[PDB]
Write a protein that binds this ligand. Structure first.
Ligand SMILES: Nc1ncnc2c1ncn2[C@@H]1O[C@H](COP(=O)(O)OP(=O)(O)OP(O)(O)=S)[C@@H](O)[C@H]1O
Ligand SMILES: [Zn+2]
Length: 239
């Protein structure tokens, strides 16, 4: 679907989180790396995308950069989600509760391939109290070669002892114009027909989320004869 196909592959592909992208790039470019990053914000605004690019910028074979090359093996594997040094943890999953608990109790201090062992934790506020302390403990005695990239829609639900040990970045819900322009850009690249009004209606219905925006666009295309027209979208949205 559009959402997976148009996942940001470079900071330049990211829509509207400038204040965050400028700080991450400055830090990366000057070799100033903190041990833990926290990305907060609502739904589908780009938290995981940015965390993933940061992990990519940190392990690029080309060197620590704010512009991962995107063609080296480390970059390709991270992209595929099959990189040995990018350990993805989902605190919100009912199914991976043990793996979540175990991996955090057994941090692998030495990367096997890349220069850093990276942990990316989704919805970190949903971790058990046990794991919170496991994490805290690691953030208190920062293993080198190991970086923690946390994401969450509710930073406040997080123990202040942990929040305090991260570099916090607050992502904003995206503007109607920010979303509208991205949809237009994507549809132009896909060579899919669209009408101005139709895109305005989808951007508005997305209500701040680029992911919901792409999901609504994919539904529009599928139910509207392989195109995005004002008439078909209005009917679909109940305009
Ligand atoms: N700022 C953005 N710029 C460009 N595309 C984006 C942006 N935010 C979201 N997208 C699209 O939305 C999809 C999901 O975005 P994510 O980065 O996973 O959002 P998120 O903020 O982590 O959302 P959750 O998991 O619901 S909290 C991506 O694969 C993109 O196609
Ligand atoms: Zn690379």
């Amino acid at each position: 679907v559009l959402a997976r196909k148009w996942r940001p592959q470079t900071f330049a592909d990211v829509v509207g989180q400038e204040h965050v992208l400028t700080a991450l790039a400055n830090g990366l470019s000057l070799g100033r790396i903190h041990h833990a990053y926290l990305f907060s914000g609502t739904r589908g605004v780009g938290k995981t995308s940015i965390a993933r690019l940061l992990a990519k910028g940190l392990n690029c074979e080309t060197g620590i950069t704010a512009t991962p090359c995107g063609v080296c093996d480390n970059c390709r594997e991270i992209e595929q989600g099959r990189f040995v040094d990018l350990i993805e943890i989902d605190a919100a999953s009912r199914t991976k509760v043990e793996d979540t608990r175990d991996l955090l109790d057994n941090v692998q201090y030495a990367p096997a391939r890349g220069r850093f062992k990276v942990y990316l934790i989704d919805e970190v506020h949903m971790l058990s109290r046990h794991s919170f302390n496991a994490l805290l403990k690691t953030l208190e005695e920062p293993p080198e070669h190991v970086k923690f990239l946390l994401a969450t829609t509710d930073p406040q639900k997080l123990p202040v002892t942990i929040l305090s040990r991260c570099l916090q970045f607050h992502l904003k819900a995206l503007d109607v114009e920010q979303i509208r322009h991205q949809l237009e850009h994507i549809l132009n690249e896909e060579h899919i027909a669209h009408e101005p009004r139709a895109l305005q209606l989808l951007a508005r219905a997305a209500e701040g989320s680029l992911r919901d925006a792409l999901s609504l666009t994919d539904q529009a295309i599928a139910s509207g004869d392989g195109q995005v027209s004002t008439q078909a979208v209005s009917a679909m949205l109940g305009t």
